[PDB]
Design a binder for this molecule. Structure first.
Ligand code: CA
Ligand code: CA
Ligand code: ZN
Lengths: 100, 153
């Protein structure tokens, strides 16, 4: 896969978790099969791409919830789809904060 | 030689009026995309003494208006003069990722989310005051994680 997903909405569900949704259309990827998505997130106060943590979801969901985050903290969030051939480009990068 | 200032309190803004008023930054004029005719009104800021987050890897943060650029460029001097060894940091400039409330001045490259390169939030109050004195038409301690700045059109 080459073209990545597109994060459509992100928001804080509470003090330690964030909800996000996204869209995706193949044909831009020749309709290749998709075996899931990687959701990357990192404390905004970091600028090093080695600080992103990673979550796995199946290619059958358009939304997800990132748990075990820090209260009242800002996070950079981006994602990518993938198959047995590797990962796609990163989606747009969204900045979302949790609850106080 | 650093100067003695009056820090802005969290969630405070200056001038003391809504951002979209004439006494502040003015009204929203439309969302600038790459395809937008007005996109060409955005110059990239390549100041060596400004740290740009650019977590998008698109250099979108550097994109802003000539006015936002002048106000920003002189704040970079104000910050180094205040805390020698510390630089101005930008976390958000013009935006096309879309996590900002509709009619956000980020979509027009007229606003910036700023911090201190060391992320010492105790410096943010002062940082906000500096932005005000740097000529920024609107300054707003928007979050614990960043200060909000914007300019007219
Ligand atoms: Ca950014
Ligand atoms: Ca952005
Ligand atoms: Zn902002």
């Amino acid at each position: 896969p080459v073209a990545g997903p597109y994060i459509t909405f992100t928001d804080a569900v509470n003090e330690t978790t964030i909800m996000l949704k996204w869209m995706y259309i193949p044909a831009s990827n020749n309709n290749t099969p998709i075996h899931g998505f990687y959701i990357y997130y990192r404390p905004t106060d970091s600028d090093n791409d080695s600080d992103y943590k990673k979550d796995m979801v199946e290619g059958d969901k358009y939304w997800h919830s990132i748990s075990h985050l820090q209260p009242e903290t800002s996070y950079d969030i981006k994602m990518q789809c993938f198959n047995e051939g590797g990962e796609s480009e990163f989606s747009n990068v969204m900045i979302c904060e949790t609850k106080a | 030689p650093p100067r003695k200032l009056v820090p802005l309190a969290y969630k405070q803004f200056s001038p003391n009026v809504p951002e979209k008023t004439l006494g502040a930054s003015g009204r929203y004029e439309g969302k600038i995309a790459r395809s937008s005719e007005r996109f060409k009104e955005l110059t990239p800021n390549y100041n060596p003494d400004i740290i740009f987050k650019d977590e998008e890897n698109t250099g979108a943060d550097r994109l802003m208006t000539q006015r936002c650029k002048d106000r920003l460029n002189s704040l970079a001097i104000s910050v180094m003069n205040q805390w020698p060894g510390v630089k101005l940091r930008v976390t958000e400039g013009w935006d096309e990722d879309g996590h900002h409330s509709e009619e956000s001045l980020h979509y027009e490259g007229r606003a910036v989310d700023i911090t201190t390169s060391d992320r010492d939030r105790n410096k943010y109050g002062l940082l906000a005051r500096l932005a005000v004195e740097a000529g920024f038409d609107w300054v707003y301690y928007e979050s614990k994680a960043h200060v909000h700045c914007s300019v007219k059109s």
